[PDB]
RNA sequence: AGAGUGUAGCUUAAAAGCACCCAACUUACACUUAGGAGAUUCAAUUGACGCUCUGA
RNA sequence: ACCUCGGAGCAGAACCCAACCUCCGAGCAGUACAUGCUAAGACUUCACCAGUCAAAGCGAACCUUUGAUCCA
Ligand SMILES: [Mg+2]
């Protein structure tokens with residue numbers, strides 16, 4: 001199945017957004033737009049929110 | 053119930069049981085061509101358009117084609133996709149051959165005929181040329197639909213045309229400030245002897261373009277008329293205003309249009325100079341104002357509407373306090 | 377001053393007024409049909425068996441500026457009227473005529489294969505280097 | 518690599534083969550219809 | 552060595568049309584090829 | 593043994609018949625599949641509903657149908673037609689009513 | 702001997718559009734892209750050079 | 758056995774129409790991570806709740822079904 005995970009900005013901002021990734025898949029690192037920084041930055045998976 | 057068609061239903065002529073023996077649209081482009089043809093064809097049903105609507109010369113041409121074919125260098129250039137064309141020679145030849153027809157198309161598209169002659173058309177037989185001398189070294193031409201600034205059009209232009217009398221007129225089809233239909237003339241030379249223009253009768257002196265600021269783009273027309281025999285004719289807008297329609301009605305017996313050349317003029321500081329220095333009046337400034345946005349009649353209870361509903365209908369953004 | 381008698385509302389009758397101000401409407405529908413009608417002027421190229429022709433047509437369908445290799449003035453300067461050279465020559469002639477007509481901006485609507493065609497690429501290069509831009513400005517709302 | 522003269526000869530070869538086989542198919546079709 | 556095989560399917564012949572068709576095929580065979588007018592199955 | 597089938601109707605169909613005055617953004621017709629195709633000044637949503645892109649009068653017409661070449665199935669369907677055949681469809685247009693603005697005198701500088 | 706007469710294969714096209722072909726993608730066809738060839742029978746609306754038909 | 762949602766017929770042509778009615782399907786996946794933010798005007802499952810579509814604008818770029826409140 002898929003799991004909802006919290007991608008946290010690697011830009012130091014407190015910004016986080018939730019994505020969906022397969023449980024068997026590797027931990028996620030993704031470019032995403034950081035509103036506070038106003039620039040695309042890396043986000044790293046921190047913790048699993050739930051299993052869906 | 054079924055009302056029968058009011059005409060030949062499409063795809064009815066070719067409706068046959070021999071579908072396998074019927075040739076098909078192997079390609080998309082041929083279907084596109086057929087579809088465009090049908091769209092152009094008139095129809096008995098409601099359609100989008102209803103609502104949104106010598107021999108020696110030929111022999112010489114064949115011989116020239118054969119000569120170009122014979123030239124092997126030409127074939128090598130063609131197959132290496134390196135050959136080119138003389139743009140000036142092509143322009144001159146087109147002007148002589150079929151340029152008048154294209155210029156008539158351009159005039160019709162720009163609406164000169166419908167606004168100058170109420171739809172009565174003609175053909176600019178004479179390859180007229182006008183150019184406003186910019187500085188001293190160069191002179192910006194005035195083709196059919198060119199774009200020339202009033203700064204460059206400040207002074208009267210140099211006119212050239214291979215012909216033999218002539219009456220040349222300049223009008224601004226849309227510069228009028230009071231009456232929508234009238235128009236202003238800038239300069240009118242009459243009884244031109246042959247080609248030389250300095251000897252023309254200057255009935256109305258020259259004016260530069262004066263399209264008001266933010267009033268869009270105005271189309272200025274150089275008309276040239278063949279003249280059989282001279283006729284005596286006749287900085288104030290009241291006397292520069294008139295209608296080319298009835299003007300040329302008064303002279304069509306011995307005058308016939310034979311040349312045209314028009315251009316688009318925008319605002320420019322020379323327009324301010326024109327409005328102040330010699331027109332001696334305050335220049336008008338126009339702004340393109342769109343209609344206010346439509347909003348449905350306000351309800352007492354805007355059910356399910358967001359909080360912005362009230363802002364859609366409030367006029368003053370500043371807080372108000374009523375009796376307090 | 378009677379010269380200062382100006383109507384409160386101006387009436388510019390130039391058909392290209394709003395189009396050049398970039399305020400005129402474009403037909404924004406026809407999403408399910410090809411080509412789009414969301415333009416003011418369109419460059420349409422017809423490659424027949426023998427002749428190559430190009431048109432600059434207004435949205436209402438009026439043909440504004442045409443350049444056909446069929447015309448003597450143009451066919452009298454090139455070998456084959458149905459090759460890349462013919463396409464580029466007609467493109468350059470059309471670019472010159474467009475500039476002299478005041479049409480600086482245009483929309484080209486080729487099929488995928490038409491775009492991939494080297495002759496169409498050469499025609500587009502000819503137009504762009506002649507000055508005409510094959511991308512109309514966005515409407516200002 | 519190749520040169521310009523051989524390319525031109527190749528193009529003329531294609532042209533003359535076009536003409537030759539055009540005559541060929543024309544005569545074949547003439548026999549057909551006849 | 553190997554011999555490459557090809558098949559052409561045909562349907563719809565007239566009286567004279569069949570004659571012209573196969574005589575043209577007979578006369579247009581380039582070099583050492585094997586024709587056939589066999590049927591399906 | 594037959595379950596389900598209690599879904600209610602979607603209340604789809606034409607919302608503005610021909611001649612009806614339509615403001616920009618009004619939904620003209622909601623359809624499940626393309627019964628009516630967008631014409632002039634008529635947009636299409638994700639769910640294939642037709643809405644007016646301008647303020648005007650709704651008109652229905654029949655026009656030749658030439659699909660987007662990237663529409664592979666439609667292109668193949670066309671490829672299988674005979675030479676004379678031309679597909680037709682019903683299109684919805686909005687004939688815009690007002691001009692998109694007027695030039696006003698603001699200041700007599 | 703007489704009649705119909707006559708634009709490259711077709712055109713109530715006026716020197717054009719369809720047709721036609723090779724090259725590449727195709728098993729192949731097709732599509733597409735590149736290229737190719739082509740005619741208003743001769744003299745002043747008219748006579749005579751060629752084709753079809755009616756006879757010997 | 759069923760209880761929610763959806764597709765087809767009944768219900769032929771705007772909408773709407775039941776059943777122990779005749780059939781079928783679903784409780785998500787794939788994708789990306791602007792699949793962002795805002796906002797005219799509209800639709801709406803016959804109420805409400807809920808559910809849809811969306812111009813313009815800003816910002817990156819150049820998507821195709823399930824469930825409220827409280828409570829944690
Ligand atoms: Mg049902």
Ligand SMILES: [Mg+2]
Nearest residue numbers: 801802803804
């Ligand atoms: Mg409701």
